[PDB]
């Protein structure tokens, strides 16, 4: 009947009022905080009326019809019918809304705000986060909200408040921005590549996680797991949160049929039990696993009868025994097995045709393995910071048309891949290094899709997801870009480049590094090292030693 009262009865008042605040923040990202709370409380009071009587007025309307009405009370997005109106909001989700940045006030200032109005301080947290990230995971933001409340609850009455709160707030910023681009990858995989390619992706990853389960259960998982993200990316956060919450009850209703590391996983509350399974470790692979059967006479019979089930079962049986290989590499091996099967089964002697099919995977498996150990030898020999600077010049020349801040954020996330995963043995480098790069590059694709400038990046992102990383590798040197004219205001740093912390000083030095390549791309690697050291030494020597404010505004070159 009334779907509004249905979700309110299953999600609860605390979650219903929180999900609506996130949905409105993702749609109308420009309106202030006070205007959104007036609509949420109006919907919350509306929801409580339909629960006491399902046969009430306006309760039978869909969730998209009611949300669009309350949102249109304040740029030509409520046009034509409802399916086009709600789709207008999804097309205007600005990946970077050019909003004022968030500053971190003092610790004693935040605890006085948390102790004054504890509900507003938590409500303003979900509003400011969801408005910057329109594609943020709705039920996972509630998990961060619970810890954001517990962080201020414990360490605002402690002795040294900054000794605990800031470490908890610094660790919470990293998980949030990592989950911002991780979920953004799943939304772009559904909107741009449809449900067919996204479903095959989840089968490869879940089979590596849960090899002890059967394909019939993984199919029930992936089908139910895909329906959740299709709702969260479309803005159906009320639906998205419910299905994920009841899925964790289904996964843990029978743990032996799914995995084995789910005992202490589901010993936690509902919000915490849904987070443990999302990043759980891979189950132990069942030993004495067979090889193939690609040798029977019914290979073409099972494929012609069901092409999706046979290819889906092959990817499952291949991923359950290969945890050391990523999903992008296995999907590449899956697309090769399909191509080698369309041409062999259409002949007269297919068995002799697809006989040596697994030998064709050798060049595709050794291609990423010989590219990870090569790039990490320079990461463990130059440092994480200099690794990003070497990757800055490596990417500023391959695509100089891209903006200045975009090349810095993408390289800093690329440099964080070596320091976070390439310290692991030779059994976990290939999975993470390709899964982490698929998130950083996708973050560079959605940030470039707003205002595109470079054409080599557009076709690189518009290509297949499995061939997205190989395209970005050797994207030419772009020996045809005219460098911008010499700008002086971009290189001159004011006297306020010293009151910032040590972290912000590195982002400014990297911002000026890509700005130097845009002025002279033909500069050598050593000609930039001396210039970078000179500029850093000038600011370091002028500001650390007291020398007024005109000493940092002279003439460098
Ligand atoms: C007034 C206190 C406060 O309000 C917010 C609203 C949205 C997101 C974070 C915060 C926040 C923080 O404590 C915070 C913590 C870290 Br660490 C940051 O790097 C930034 Br920026 C902000
Ligand atoms: C505890 C504070 C905090 O919680 C988060 C949850 C998810 C994503 C980011 C954050 C975050 C930030 O520090 C933060 C920092 C900057 Br800068 C932003 O522009 C935004 Br927005 C958020
Ligand atoms: C086991 C690791 C894993 O890798 C994926 C890749 C694509 C889509 C889903 C998953 C997935 C999940 O099982 C999963 C389960 C829940 Br519950 C989530 O809230 C999220 Br997020 C992910
Ligand atoms: C950051 C760690 C890392 O992990 C990998 C796994 C496979 C292939 C390359 C890499 C790699 C790189 O250093 C790297 C370097 C350049 Br230059 C690129 O354009 C791209 Br893309 C990636």
UniProtKB/Swiss-Prot annotation:
Its main location: secreted. InterPro entries: ALB/AFP/VDB (IPR000264), Serum_albumin-like (IPR020858), Serum_albumin/AFP/Afamin (IPR021177), Serum_albumin_CS (IPR020857), Serum_albumin_N (IPR014760). Pfam families: Serum_albumin (PF00273). One of its GO terms (biological process) is cellular response to calcium ion starvation. The modification Phosphoserine is found at residues 2, 55, 62, 260, 403, 473. Gene3D superfamilies: 1.10.246.10. SUPFAM superfamilies: Serum albumin-like. Changing residue 554 to K: In Osaka-2/Phnom Phen/albumin B/Verona. GO terms for molecular function: antioxidant activity; copper ion binding; DNA binding; enterobactin binding; exogenous protein binding; fatty acid binding; identical protein binding; protein-folding chaperone binding. Disulfide bonds join 50-59, 72-78, 77-88, 111-156, 155-164, 187-233, 232-240, 252-266, 265-276, 300-345, 344-353, 376-422, 421-432, 445-461, 460-471, 498-543, 542-551. Binds water, Ca(2+), Na(+), K(+), fatty acids, hormones, bilirubin and drugs. Its main function is the regulation of the colloidal osmotic pressure of blood. Major zinc transporter in plasma, typically binds about 80% of all plasma zinc. Major calcium and magnesium transporter in plasma, binds approximately 45% of circulating calcium and magnesium in plasma. Potentially has more than two calcium-binding sites and might additionally bind calcium in a non-specific manner. Changing residue 101 to G: In Yanomama-2. It comes from Homo sapiens. GO terms for cellular component: blood microparticle; cytoplasm; endoplasmic reticulum; endoplasmic reticulum lumen; extracellular exosome; extracellular region; extracellular space; Golgi apparatus. The modification Phosphothreonine is found at residues 404, 406. This is Albumin. (4Z,15Z)-bilirubin IXalpha binds at residue 227. The modification N6-succinyllysine is found at residues 192, 420, 503, 548. Changing residue 256 to G: In Nagasaki-1. Changing residue 356 to E: In Naskapi/Mersin/Komagome-1. Belongs to the ALB/AFP/VDB family. The record marks 186 as: Aspirin-acetylated lysine. Ca(2+) 2 binds at residues 10, 242, 246. Residues 1-173, 174-363, 364-557 form the Albumin domain. Ca(2+) 1 binds at residues 3, 231, 236, 239. The record marks 1, 17, 38, 61, 70, 80, 93, 123, 146, 161, 168, 177, 182, 192, 199, 227, 249, 261, 273, 343, 356, 373, 386, 398, 416, 420, 450, 459, 484, 503, 508, 522, 525, 541, 544, 548 as: Not glycated. The lineage of its organism: Eukaryota, Metazoa, Chordata, Craniata, Vertebrata. Keywords: Calcium, Cleavage on pair of basic residues, Copper, Disease variant, Disulfide bond, Glycation, Glycoprotein, Lipid-binding, Metal-binding, Methylation, Phosphoprotein, Repeat, Secreted, Signal, Zinc.
């Amino acid at each position: 009947k009334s779907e509004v009262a249905h979700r309110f009865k299953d999600l609860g008042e605390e979650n219903f009022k929180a999900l609506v605040l996130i949905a409105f923040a993702q749609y109308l990202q420009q309106c202030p905080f006070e205007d959104h709370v007036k609509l949420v409380n109006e919907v919350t009071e509306f929801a409580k009326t339909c629960v006491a009587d399902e046969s009430a007025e306006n309760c039978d309307k869909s969730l998209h019809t009611l949300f669009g009405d309350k949102l249109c009370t304040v740029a030509d997005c409520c046009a034509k019918q409802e399916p086009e109106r709600n789709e207008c909001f999804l097309q205007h989700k600005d990946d970077n809304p050019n909003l004022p940045r968030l500053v971190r006030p003092e610790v004693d200032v935040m605890c006085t705000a948390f102790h004054d109005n504890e509900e507003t301080f938590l409500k303003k947290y979900l509003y400011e986060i969801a408005r910057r990230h329109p594609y943020f995971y709705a039920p996972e933001l509630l998990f961060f909200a619970k810890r954001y409340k517990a962080a201020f609850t414990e360490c605002c009455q402690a002795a040294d408040k900054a000794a605990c709160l800031l470490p908890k707030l610094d660790e919470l910023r990293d998980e949030g921005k990592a989950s911002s681009a991780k979920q953004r990858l799943k939304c772009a995989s559904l909107q741009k590549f449809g449900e067919r390619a996204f479903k095959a992706w989840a089968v490869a990853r879940l089979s590596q996680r849960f090899p002890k389960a059967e394909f019939a259960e993984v199919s029930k998982l992936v089908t139910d797991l895909t329906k959740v993200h299709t709702e969260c990316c479309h803005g159906d956060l009320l639906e998205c949160a419910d299905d994920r919450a009841d899925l964790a009850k289904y996964i843990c209703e029978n743990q032996d049929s799914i995995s084995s590391k789910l005992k202490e996983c589901c010993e936690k509350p509902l919000l915490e039990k849904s987070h443990c399974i999302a990043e759980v470790e891979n189950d132990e692979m069942p030993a004495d696993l067979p090889s193939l059967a690609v040798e029977s006479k019914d290979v073409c019979k099972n494929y012609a009868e069901a092409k999706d089930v046979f290819l889906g079962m092959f990817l499952y049986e291949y991923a359950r025994r290969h945890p050391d290989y990523s999903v992008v590499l296995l999907l590449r091996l899956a697309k090769t097995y399909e191509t080698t099967l369309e041409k062999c089964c259409a002949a007269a002697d297919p068995h002799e045709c697809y006989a040596k099919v697994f030998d064709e995977f050798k060049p595709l498996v050794e291609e990423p393995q010989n590219l990870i150990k090569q790039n990490c030898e320079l990461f463990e020999q130059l440092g994480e910071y200099k690794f990003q600077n070497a990757l800055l010049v490596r990417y500023t020349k391959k695509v100089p048309q891209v903006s200045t801040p975009t090349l810095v954020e993408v390289s800093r996330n690329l440099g964080k891949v070596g320091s976070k995963c390439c310290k692991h043995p030779e059994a976990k480098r290939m999975p993470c290094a390709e899964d982490y790069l698929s998130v950083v590059l996708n973050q560079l694709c959605v940030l470039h899709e707003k205002t595109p400038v470079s054409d080599r990046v557009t076709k690189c992102c518009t290509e297949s997801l499995v061939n997205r990383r190989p395209c970005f590798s050797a994207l030419e040197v772009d020996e045809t870009y005219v460098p911008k004219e010499f700008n002086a205001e971009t290189f001159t740093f004011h006297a306020d480049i010293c009151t910032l912390s040590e972290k912000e000083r590195q982002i400014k030095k990297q911002t000026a590094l890509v700005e130097l390549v845009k002025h002279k791309p033909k500069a050598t690697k050593e000609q930039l090292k001396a210039v970078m050291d000179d500029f850093a030494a000038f600011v370091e020597k002028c500001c650390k030693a007291d020398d007024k404010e005109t000493c940092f505004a002279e003439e460098g070159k």
